[PDB]
Amino acid sequence: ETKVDRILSSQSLIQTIKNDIVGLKAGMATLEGM
Amino acid sequence: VWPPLNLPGNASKGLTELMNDNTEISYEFTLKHWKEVSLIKFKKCFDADAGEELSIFMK
């Protein structure tokens, strides 16, 4: 139980990675526009 | 409402402005972002048409 709770907590990193990648996608479209 | 597509990119806040149809986008706000919209494609035409005003060619 303690170890699964630890795994479940790190799932916060995944969506943070998720949001940042959204910004990287838009920012790259900008560079591509140049 | 505004244009048919006005929110391509990041930040759900611009997406909020879009889906909510806020009549205003503060300069102070839009300074804090990039590519506030990308009305760029190769398909169709928006919000206009041509072939009018018979004046000009007569000049």
Side-chain angles (χ1 to χ4, degrees), chain A residues 11-26:
Chain A
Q11 313 283 309
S12 62
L13 299 161
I14 297 267
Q15 178 240 357
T16 280
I17 290 162
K18 193 272 151 154
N19 295 326
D20 292 349
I21 297 193
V22 172
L24 292 183
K25 295 261 252 182

Side-chain angles (χ1 to χ4, degrees), chain A residues 22-23 26 30, chain B residues 9-11 35:
Chain A
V22 172
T30 297
Chain B
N10 27 346
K35 293 297 290 182

